[PDB]
């Protein structure tokens, strides 16, 4: 993207993996 919006964007990756349920992406 033209702007990464990083960190806030980066957490969305593990958020979709379910960090809200405590399921990690690692």
mmCIF file of C-alpha atoms in Angstrom:
data_model
loop_
_atom_site.group_PDB
_atom_site.id
_atom_site.type_symbol
_atom_site.label_atom_id
_atom_site.label_comp_id
_atom_site.label_asym_id
_atom_site.label_seq_id
_atom_site.Cartn_x
_atom_site.Cartn_y
_atom_site.Cartn_z
ATOM 1 C CA UNK A 1 0.000 0.000 0.000
ATOM 2 C CA UNK A 2 1.079 3.657 -0.305
ATOM 3 C CA UNK A 3 0.842 3.956 3.486
ATOM 4 C CA UNK A 4 1.370 0.837 5.616
ATOM 5 C CA UNK A 5 -0.285 2.211 8.796
ATOM 6 C CA UNK A 6 2.105 -0.328 10.375
ATOM 7 C CA UNK A 7 1.724 -1.894 13.837
ATOM 8 C CA UNK A 8 -1.975 -1.082 13.859
ATOM 9 C CA UNK A 9 -2.087 -2.857 10.518
ATOM 10 C CA UNK A 10 0.422 -5.492 11.641
ATOM 11 C CA UNK A 11 -1.761 -6.633 14.542
ATOM 12 C CA UNK A 12 -4.695 -7.176 12.147
ATOM 13 C CA UNK A 13 -2.846 -10.270 10.889
ATOM 14 C CA UNK A 14 -2.937 -12.092 14.258
ATOM 15 C CA UNK A 15 -6.370 -10.513 14.932
ATOM 16 C CA UNK A 16 -7.835 -12.395 11.978
ATOM 17 C CA UNK A 17 -6.034 -15.501 13.278
ATOM 18 C CA UNK A 18 -8.097 -15.037 16.442
ATOM 19 C CA UNK A 19 -5.949 -13.218 19.067
ATOM 20 C CA UNK A 20 -9.326 -12.013 20.374
ATOM 21 C CA UNK A 21 -9.910 -15.657 21.398
ATOM 22 C CA UNK A 22 -6.209 -15.860 22.406
ATOM 23 C CA UNK A 23 -5.388 -18.007 19.349
ATOM 24 C CA UNK A 24 -1.887 -16.912 18.236
ATOM 25 C CA UNK A 25 -0.354 -16.773 14.728
ATOM 26 C CA UNK A 26 2.973 -18.051 16.113
#
